[PDB]
Design a protein around this motif. Structure first.
Motif, PDB file in Angstrom:
ATOM      1  N   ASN A 267     -84.381  46.190 104.249  1.00  0.00           N
ATOM      2  CA  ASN A 267     -84.625  46.956 103.021  1.00  0.00           C
ATOM      3  C   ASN A 267     -84.233  46.142 101.809  1.00  0.00           C
ATOM      4  OD1 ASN A 267     -85.622  49.124 104.645  1.00  0.00           O
ATOM      5  ND2 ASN A 267     -83.580  50.014 104.737  1.00  0.00           N
TER       6      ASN A 267
ATOM      7  N   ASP B  53     -87.114  41.220  93.486  1.00  0.00           N
ATOM      8  CA  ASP B  53     -85.746  40.760  93.222  1.00  0.00           C
ATOM      9  C   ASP B  53     -85.197  39.654  94.128  1.00  0.00           C
ATOM     10  OD1 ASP B  53     -86.065  43.507  91.988  1.00  0.00           O
ATOM     11  OD2 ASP B  53     -83.961  43.217  91.417  1.00  0.00           O
TER      12      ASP B  53
ATOM     13  N   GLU C 287     -77.623  33.055  94.600  1.00  0.00           N
ATOM     14  CA  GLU C 287     -76.810  34.167  95.095  1.00  0.00           C
ATOM     15  C   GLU C 287     -77.237  34.598  96.506  1.00  0.00           C
ATOM     16  OE1 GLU C 287     -74.024  36.243  93.903  1.00  0.00           O
ATOM     17  OE2 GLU C 287     -73.660  34.568  92.518  1.00  0.00           O
TER      18      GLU C 287
ATOM     19  N   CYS D  27     -76.532  37.155  99.713  1.00  0.00           N
ATOM     20  CA  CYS D  27     -75.945  38.436 100.107  1.00  0.00           C
ATOM     21  C   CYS D  27     -76.315  38.872 101.535  1.00  0.00           C
ATOM     22  CB  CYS D  27     -76.264  39.529  99.091  1.00  0.00           C
ATOM     23  SG  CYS D  27     -75.397  39.331  97.508  1.00  0.00           S
TER      24      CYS D  27
ATOM     25  N   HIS E   4     -68.603  48.432 102.588  1.00  0.00           N
ATOM     26  CA  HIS E   4     -68.455  48.461 101.131  1.00  0.00           C
ATOM     27  C   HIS E   4     -67.270  47.580 100.724  1.00  0.00           C
ATOM     28  CE1 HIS E   4     -67.408  50.280  97.175  1.00  0.00           C
ATOM     29  NE2 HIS E   4     -68.729  50.173  97.007  1.00  0.00           N
TER      30      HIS E   4
ATOM     31  N   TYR F 276     -72.787  50.739  91.024  1.00  0.00           N
ATOM     32  CA  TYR F 276     -72.780  50.342  92.428  1.00  0.00           C
ATOM     33  C   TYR F 276     -72.006  51.336  93.311  1.00  0.00           C
ATOM     34  CZ  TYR F 276     -71.713  47.627  96.658  1.00  0.00           C
ATOM     35  OH  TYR F 276     -71.541  47.211  97.957  1.00  0.00           O
ATOM     36  N   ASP F 277     -70.821  51.786  92.847  1.00  0.00           N
ATOM     37  CA  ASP F 277     -69.969  52.744  93.562  1.00  0.00           C
ATOM     38  C   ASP F 277     -70.658  54.111  93.732  1.00  0.00           C
ATOM     39  OD1 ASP F 277     -68.097  50.661  93.367  1.00  0.00           O
ATOM     40  OD2 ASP F 277     -66.522  51.896  92.461  1.00  0.00           O
TER      41      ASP F 277
ATOM     42  N   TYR G 259     -73.366  53.784  96.309  1.00  0.00           N
ATOM     43  CA  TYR G 259     -72.751  53.793  97.630  1.00  0.00           C
ATOM     44  C   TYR G 259     -72.483  55.211  98.110  1.00  0.00           C
ATOM     45  CZ  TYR G 259     -69.617  52.946 101.575  1.00  0.00           C
ATOM     46  OH  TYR G 259     -69.004  52.940 102.809  1.00  0.00           O
TER      47      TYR G 259
ATOM     48  N   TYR H 299     -75.736  56.697  98.919  1.00  0.00           N
ATOM     49  CA  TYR H 299     -76.127  56.061 100.179  1.00  0.00           C
ATOM     50  C   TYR H 299     -75.442  56.716 101.380  1.00  0.00           C
ATOM     51  CZ  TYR H 299     -76.222  51.984 103.484  1.00  0.00           C
ATOM     52  OH  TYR H 299     -76.362  51.141 104.554  1.00  0.00           O
TER      53      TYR H 299
ATOM     54  N   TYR I  90     -83.411  56.864 101.545  1.00  0.00           N
ATOM     55  CA  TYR I  90     -82.291  56.041 102.021  1.00  0.00           C
ATOM     56  C   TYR I  90     -82.671  54.565 101.896  1.00  0.00           C
ATOM     57  CZ  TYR I  90     -79.185  53.616 105.315  1.00  0.00           C
ATOM     58  OH  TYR I  90     -78.306  52.726 105.893  1.00  0.00           O
ATOM     59  N   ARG I  91     -83.908  54.235 102.314  1.00  0.00           N
ATOM     60  CA  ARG I  91     -84.547  52.914 102.321  1.00  0.00           C
ATOM     61  C   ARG I  91     -84.547  52.324 100.892  1.00  0.00           C
ATOM     62  NH1 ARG I  91     -88.438  51.446 107.212  1.00  0.00           N
ATOM     63  NH2 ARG I  91     -89.221  49.426 106.465  1.00  0.00           N
TER      64      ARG I  91
ATOM     65  N   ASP J 184     -80.847  51.673  99.700  1.00  0.00           N
ATOM     66  CA  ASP J 184     -80.452  50.400 100.309  1.00  0.00           C
ATOM     67  C   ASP J 184     -81.086  49.214  99.550  1.00  0.00           C
ATOM     68  OD1 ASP J 184     -78.913  48.976 102.297  1.00  0.00           O
ATOM     69  OD2 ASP J 184     -80.621  48.906 103.701  1.00  0.00           O
ATOM     70  N   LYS J 185     -82.361  49.338  99.126  1.00  0.00           N
ATOM     71  CA  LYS J 185     -83.090  48.329  98.335  1.00  0.00           C
ATOM     72  C   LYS J 185     -82.403  48.117  96.985  1.00  0.00           C
ATOM     73  CE  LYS J 185     -87.728  48.602 100.328  1.00  0.00           C
ATOM     74  NZ  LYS J 185     -88.867  49.552 100.438  1.00  0.00           N
TER      75      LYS J 185
ATOM     76  N   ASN K 277     -79.079  46.263  97.429  1.00  0.00           N
ATOM     77  CA  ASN K 277     -79.263  44.865  97.799  1.00  0.00           C
ATOM     78  C   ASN K 277     -79.643  43.973  96.589  1.00  0.00           C
ATOM     79  OD1 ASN K 277     -78.397  45.049 100.509  1.00  0.00           O
ATOM     80  ND2 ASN K 277     -80.389  45.785 101.162  1.00  0.00           N
ATOM     81  N   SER K 278     -80.176  44.586  95.529  1.00  0.00           N
ATOM     82  CA  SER K 278     -80.537  43.930  94.282  1.00  0.00           C
ATOM     83  C   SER K 278     -79.372  43.826  93.329  1.00  0.00           C
ATOM     84  CB  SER K 278     -81.661  44.689  93.592  1.00  0.00           C
ATOM     85  OG  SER K 278     -82.872  44.476  94.294  1.00  0.00           O
TER      86      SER K 278
ATOM     87  N   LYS L  92     -75.974  44.113  94.247  1.00  0.00           N
ATOM     88  CA  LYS L  92     -74.846  43.446  94.927  1.00  0.00           C
ATOM     89  C   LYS L  92     -74.722  41.970  94.472  1.00  0.00           C
ATOM     90  CE  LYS L  92     -74.441  44.383  99.670  1.00  0.00           C
ATOM     91  NZ  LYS L  92     -74.866  45.228 100.826  1.00  0.00           N
ATOM     92  N   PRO L  93     -75.795  41.124  94.486  1.00  0.00           N
ATOM     93  CA  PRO L  93     -75.630  39.730  94.023  1.00  0.00           C
ATOM     94  C   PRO L  93     -75.309  39.568  92.535  1.00  0.00           C
ATOM     95  CG  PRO L  93     -77.942  40.196  94.436  1.00  0.00           C
ATOM     96  CD  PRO L  93     -77.173  41.358  94.968  1.00  0.00           C
ATOM     97  N   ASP L  94     -75.874  40.442  91.675  1.00  0.00           N
ATOM     98  CA  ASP L  94     -75.634  40.411  90.229  1.00  0.00           C
ATOM     99  C   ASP L  94     -74.193  40.790  89.929  1.00  0.00           C
ATOM    100  OD1 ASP L  94     -78.436  39.849  89.717  1.00  0.00           O
ATOM    101  OD2 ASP L  94     -78.865  42.006  89.608  1.00  0.00           O
TER     102      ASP L  94
ATOM    103  N   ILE M 187     -71.596  40.331  91.879  1.00  0.00           N
ATOM    104  CA  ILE M 187     -70.781  39.198  92.305  1.00  0.00           C
ATOM    105  C   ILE M 187     -70.756  38.112  91.239  1.00  0.00           C
ATOM    106  CG2 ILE M 187     -70.150  37.513  94.165  1.00  0.00           C
ATOM    107  CD1 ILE M 187     -70.308  40.941  94.776  1.00  0.00           C
TER     108      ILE M 187
END
Ligand SMILES: CC(=O)Nc1cn2cc(-c3cnc(N)c(O[C@@H](C)C(F)(F)F)n3)ccc2n1
Lengths: 1009, 249
Positions: free
Chosen positions: A329, A334, A402, A404, A434, B121-122, B125, B128, B214-215, B218-219, B222-223, B225-227, B229
């Motif tokens: 997913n 992106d 990056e 992940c 998490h 993000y939180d 989650y 999610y 949900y899908r 999750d997408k 995943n977009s 999460k790297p930003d 960081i």
């Protein structure tokens, strides 16, 4: 599978007072019956068979008593309702329907299996289904542990049976610390022995002055000698013949059934420290033995049912083919590309370099690529694992990319039968925890995700013309400058740096290491696990290794020591040297390390289960720690299988546990209503609802007359409904109280106040309160009377828990309600006026020091006037331990050890008894010495605390994910410095946070006063 | 002090983040966690801690003038001569705004963007986790419906089997009113199976919808999460330059 909610029907928390139930008669007819929600099945069946005569084919129906009811439960199970005394609201029905059937099959088995299913939170029939041979094997082979434990329990019946239910709650040693022994009158204790005299059950006192080390029988002898005399040939005859009584704690189910010094029993030990009068009760052995029903174990139905090459002969390198993944997913816009990251691990250490597949597009996850590893197949250690993940890669920010993880998965390279993996394999991958940023998750569990609507990775392992089996253990078995350096390495903490030079030095002196057994963890990390020859040599050394302390053996059970010989050695140190006292103390951690085990069947699971089945105090907390985690799909199969075997063999305690389980379910449901449908309602309206609901017989039956899940020694009798309320806090906590039904309740605890909280995770609090308890135990053993208050806290489910209420206490903010900074001391003066003023200031100072050192070491959530409570007698304590360690490192990049508990003017005025210039007093100097000794006493035991935190890494606690999270206590304890430099550091943090008041007083050069 | 691979008061945990997933040969020198220096070398997926020990420098009989001499020697020659087995190939260089005010304003900006992004993000989650819980609940209820439908169908099968001969009997006896009673019950039964089947069908729809929801959750995760960081690394980089630009102890 497990129930979604605790509702009376699916999508309906409570049944209305009257409900229509579809009844399916055995003649194929259907009768819609209006039933009361609380009616029993006896009533519903009688009212149905009366009505059934007003319906066609009524002549085809047998006598009402030839049948039972069957229905579909919320667990999607078809349940036969043999116990017709159960109410309709308590059946956990999916829809309001009941099917009439004639009872078939083994009634006793079906009933027991339903009782187990209810307790463990899932139908036991789901296990019979499981195709995994490892699963079916665990279910059969574990029964040997069950039979063994039951036999050991029913050996010396009834004494061995009584010791099972009521184990001695004793300290690990009879040795009394100097400050404890001095509290005694020339080594003598004043005990009150009570007797409940027939026929009025009248209470009679007997004060006795006896040696602290008097065995319980000796205490009975003094009572038997005081109840007759205040002759000689008669007294000796009377005492010898009258050793047919037992001692019990007044007000609770704690017995003195074993010959231990009276002072070694924790209750008596606690009385001496507190300066409290020990209230004991004398009752006949016959009265107790006859209150112990028979605990018979039955072998279940599943127990009575129907060319190999060695790894060392395989001359090739390790390679694994990554074929494809069903999906991932990720939005194509992106992310640039996706790949599979893999590693070969031994614990958390890679055995060779990590290898990736090539980068492929998001839309097409196909690799069809063999990954070659820098490891020779015979060199694979027994605990070798493949740790993998699917990662996303996004460049776009210069040459900066990056990476992940999207989903992870781990696999054992050898199965439970020692077979090396071969051929094709499909692996369903897990969500990334998490907070986890690392591309792989080696600490994570092994095996495929049971949820199959998840990304599925296709792999292929090599075939070597046969079944490769790991070689047999018999096949495997084929100066003062250096002595000082070794001792220095062994005293270092579990997480201290080991240089390559030190590893080489330890490996070179491996045979001499046996002279200092405690260096074993340091020596085991020095081994090259990717060398069969180095491992073989380590195996011969561990086989004959001298025993280590159980607190050091626990380290070899964490994620850093996955080897079965190392782990087998560890379990044996626990088998011979771990007191039941310390097993109870470390149970949280011991349960957690079962997640690290490669296989279902292991020495640890067998050790813990035998102990749970031979000691009911261990069995109680063993059951609740496993049950609270039954929602967690990573461990629910393992834990459900372990819980099934425990419930199957625990005897009568299953009946008691099911009463606790059902009391908790009603409280979960009651709070879910208040939080969901009734969330917008006022406190008055919510309170009116709670009052009406709690009065219902179904509720009344379930919530009265059960054992406290916080401490099963406490009996929860009738509810004190006028004292039960919904608290003002955000997730609707319930404040509950019950009568103590014990005949002598007046003496110990007339109140059983508990906060039920449905909404927040209480695991971290439960861990913190355990640590505070262990820290306070270190201090007491060292003669430091720093009184801590680790109040009861138990996680009973997913963000569901119990908190023991501390009676006669108020928050600082409650006390402050006048405006002053002297308010606190004035409040304490008014509560402890007269001669008892000195004792209150002492207690406040001592508790203050303990909390000051504990919260600083642990890095607990910021203290404030709502978080800090004070008892009426001066005792200070902290509440709400939701946070610990480095919780602000990621949020704010700042690097400074916080002082959570800053002793403001208010606390200073109390300690210095109102005096102006609080830091300049002799009471403040005394308080500083307390902090100093407390700090160093914990630093001296740092190995324990580091190990306890290391054992929790796989728990799923947000603030405990890596060893990097544990590095915080290494900082607060200044573990990379000298003891003297560490005390200087603590003083500096205290000074920085308080703006002066804490500097030297000894000399900075040598630290002498 | 001027050497690129020499970092000062950086912790063992800071070195770990720098060496995370690096190639063999990657190294850096820092001050010992307490012998005043520690070399860290990336070898076989692990970080090797080698102590630098006199008037001389070395690991073992010390024989080097400086730390730079000891490093540069092994930077061109394999560490095999000491022990085997790799050269100090890749140094972690301490080299990659003008004023404290420009830096401070950029820090405030990144710290705001970071606190925004971490709160989002939180919340994603929790969204999610709840969607994951609900999907699990729906799948369990579908299984319960499947079992319920089976029972109600067994009841039709049973009603048919038992009434067949009885309705044959009543047909002969002219008791049509009794036939109408058996049929009315059987219809009540069939309507009810129709109601349950529809209820399961409607839940199967809800599940397909929520499974797709949900899908997408999750997408979205995943977009960001790297930003999240990189923004945190930038935020932390600015804190570092602000400490260095400011007056120090
Ligand atoms: C007389 C009296 O008030 N005694 C008393 C109160 N008390 C409160 C807690 C406790 C612990 N941890 C928490 N997180 C928490 O939180 C509260 C806000 C809620 F959420 F439960 F409501 N409360 C523990 C011991 C204790 N003893």
């Amino acid at each position: 599978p497990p129930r979604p909610s605790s509702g009376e029907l699916w999508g309906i928390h409570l049944m209305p007072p009257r409900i229509l139930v579809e009844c399916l008669l055995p003649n194929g007819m259907i009768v819609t019956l209006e039933c009361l929600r609380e009616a029993t099945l006896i009533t519903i069946k009688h009212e149905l068979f009366k009505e059934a005569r007003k319906y066609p084919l009524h002549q085809l129906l047998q006598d009402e008593s030839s049948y039972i009811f069957v229905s579909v439960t919320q667990e999607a199970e078809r349940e036969e309702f043999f116990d017709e005394t159960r109410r309709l609201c308590d059946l956990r029905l999916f829809q309001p329907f009941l099917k009439v059937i004639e009872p078939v099959g083994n009634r006793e088995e079906k009933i027991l299996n339903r009782e187990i299913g209810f307790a463990i939170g899932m139908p036991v029939c789901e296990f019979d289904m499981v195709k995994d041979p490892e699963v079916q094997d665990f279910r059969r082979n574990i029964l040997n542990v069950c039979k063994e434990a039951v036999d050991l329990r029913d050996l010396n019946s009834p004494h061995s049976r009584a010791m099972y239910v009521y184990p001695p709650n004793v300290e690990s040693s009879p040795e009394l610390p100097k400050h404890i022994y001095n509290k005694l009158d020339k080594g003598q204790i004043i005990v009150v022995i009570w007797v409940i005299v027939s026929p009025n059950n009248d209470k009679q006192k007997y004060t006795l002055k006896i040696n602290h080390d008097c065995v319980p029988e000796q205490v009975i002898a003094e009572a038997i000698r005081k109840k007759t005399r205040s002759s000689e040939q008669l007294k000796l005859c009377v005492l010898e013949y009258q050793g047919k009584y037992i001692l019990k704690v007044c007000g609770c189910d704690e017995y003195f059934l074993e010959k231990y010094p009276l002072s070694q029993y924790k209750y008596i030990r606690s009385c001496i420290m507190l300066g409290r009068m020990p209230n004991l009760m004398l009752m006949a052995k016959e009265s107790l033995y006859s209150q112990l029903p028979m605990d018979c174990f039955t072998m279940p139905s599943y127990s009575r049912r129907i060319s190999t090459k060695s790894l060392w002969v395989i001359n090739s390198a390790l390679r694994i083919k990554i074929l494809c993944a069903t999906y991932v997913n990720v939005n194509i816009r992106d992310i640039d590309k996706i790949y599979v990251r893999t590693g070969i691990y031994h614990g958390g250490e890679p055995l060779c370099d990590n290898v990736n597949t090539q980068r492929v597009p998001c839309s097409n996850p196909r690799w069809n690529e063999w990954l070659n590893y820098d490891i020779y197949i015979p060199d694979l250690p027994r605990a070798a694992r493949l740790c993998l993940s699917i990662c996303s890669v996004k460049g776009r920010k210069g040459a900066k990319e990056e990476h992940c993880p999207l989903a992870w998965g781990n696999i054992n390279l050898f199965d439970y039968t020692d077979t090396l993996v071969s051929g094709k394999m499909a692996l369903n991958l897990w969500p990334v925890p998490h907070g986890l940023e690392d591309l792989l998750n080696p600490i994570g569990v092994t095996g495929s995700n049971p949820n199959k609507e998840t990304p599925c990775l296709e792999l292929e392992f090599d075939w070597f013309s046969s079944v490769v089996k790991f070689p047999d253990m018999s096949v495997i078995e084929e100066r003062e400058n250096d002595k000082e350096q070794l001792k220095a390495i062994s005293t270092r903490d579990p997480l201290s740096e080991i240089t390559e030079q030190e590893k080489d030095f330890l490996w070179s002196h491996r045979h001499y290491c046996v002279t200092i057994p405690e260096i074993l963890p340091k020596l085991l990390l020095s081994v090259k696990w990717n060398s069969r020859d180095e491992v073989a040599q380590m195996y011969c050394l561990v086989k004959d290794w001298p025993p280590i302390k159980p607190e050091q053996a626990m380290e070899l059970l964490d994620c850093n020591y996955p080897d079965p010989m190392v782990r087998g050695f560890a379990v044996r140190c626990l088998e011979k040297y771990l007191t039941d006292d310390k097993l109870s103390q470390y149970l949280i951690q011991l349960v957690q390390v079962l997640k690290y085990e490669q296989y279902l069947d292991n020495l640890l699971v067998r050790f813990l289960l035998k102990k749970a089945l031979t000691n009911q105090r261990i069995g109680h907390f063993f059951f609740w720690h496993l049950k609270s985690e039954m929602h967690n799909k990573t461990v629910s199969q393992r834990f459900g299988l372990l819980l099934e075997s425990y419930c199957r063999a625990c005897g009568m305690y299953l009946k008691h546990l099911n009463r606790q389980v059902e009391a908790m379910e009603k409280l979960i449901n009651l709070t879910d209503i208040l939080k969901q449908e009734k969330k917008d309602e006022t406190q008055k309206v919510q309170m009116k609802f709670l009052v009406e609901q709690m009065r219902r017989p179904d509720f009344m039956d379930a919530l009265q007359g059960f054992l406290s899940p916080l401490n099963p020694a406490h009996q929860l009798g009738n509810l004190r409904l006028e004292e039960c309320r919904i608290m003002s806090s955000a997730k609707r906590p319930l404040w509950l109280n019950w009568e103590n039904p014990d005949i002598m309740s007046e003496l110990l605890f007339q109140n059983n106040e508990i906060i039920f909280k449905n909404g927040d995770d209480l695991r971290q609090d439960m861990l913190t309160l355990q640590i505070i308890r262990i820290m306070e135990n270190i201090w007491q053993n060292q003669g430091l009377d720093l009184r801590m208050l680790p109040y009861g806290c138990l996680s009973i489910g997913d963000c569901v828990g119990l908190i023991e209420v501390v009676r006669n206490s108020h928050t600082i903010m409650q006390i402050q309600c006048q405006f002053n900074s002297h308010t606190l001391h004035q409040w304490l003066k008014d509560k402890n006026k007269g001669e008892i003023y000195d004792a209150a200031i002492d207690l406040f100072t001592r508790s203050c020091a303990g909390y000051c050192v504990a919260t600083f070491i642990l890095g607990i959530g910021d203290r404030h006037n709502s978080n800090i409570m004070v008892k009426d007698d001066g005792q200070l304590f902290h509440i709400d331990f939701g946070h610990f360690l480095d919780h602000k490192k990621k949020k704010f990049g700042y690097k400074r050890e916080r002082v959570p508990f800053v002793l403001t003017q208010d606390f200073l005025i109390v300690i210095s008894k109102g005096a102006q210039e609080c830091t300049k007093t002799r009471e403040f100097e005394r308080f500083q010495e307390m902090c100093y000794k407390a700090y160093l006493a914990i630093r001296q035991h740092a190995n324990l605390f580091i190990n306890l935190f290391s054992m929790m890494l796989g728990s799923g606690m947000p603030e405990l994910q890596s060893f990097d999270d544990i590095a915080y206590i290494r900082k607060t304890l200044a573990l990379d410095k000298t003891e003297q430099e560490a005390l200087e550091y603590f003083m500096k943090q205290m000074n920085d946070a308080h703006h002066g008041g804490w500097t030297t007083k000894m000399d900075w050069i040598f630290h002498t006063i | 002090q001027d050497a690129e691979w020499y970092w000062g008061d950086i912790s063992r945990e800071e070195v770990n983040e720098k060496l995370r997933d690096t190639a063999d040969g990657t190294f850096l020198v820092r001050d010992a966690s307490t012998g005043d220096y520690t070399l860290t070398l990336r070898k076989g997926g692990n970080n090797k801690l080698i102590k630098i020990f006199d008037g001389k420098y070395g690991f073992s009989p010390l024989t080097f003038s400086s730390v730079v001499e000891l490093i540069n020697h092994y930077r061109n020659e394999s560490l095999a001569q000491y022990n085997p087995d790799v050269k100090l190939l890749y140094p972690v260089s301490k080299y990659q705004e003008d004023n404290i005010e420009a830096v401070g304003k950029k820090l405030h900006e990144y710290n705001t963007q970071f606190q925004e992004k971490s709160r989002e993000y939180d919340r994603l989650y929790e969204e999610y986790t709840r969607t994951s819980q609900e999907i699990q609940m729906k799948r369990t209820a579908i299984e319960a419906f499947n079992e319920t439908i089976k029972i109600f169908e067994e009841q039709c099968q049973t009603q048919e089997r038992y009434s067949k001969e009885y309705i044959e009997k009543f047909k002969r006896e002219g008791n049509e009113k009794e036939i109408q009673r058996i049929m009315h019950n059987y219809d009540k039964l069939k309507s009810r199976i129709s109601e349950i089947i529809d209820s399961r069908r409607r839940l199967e729809e809800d599940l397909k919808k929520q499974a797709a929801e949900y899908r997408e959750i999750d997408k979205r995760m995943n977009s960001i999460k790297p930003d999240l960081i990189q923004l945190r690394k930038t935020r932390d980089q600015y804190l570092m330059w602000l400490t260095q630009k400011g007056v120090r102890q």
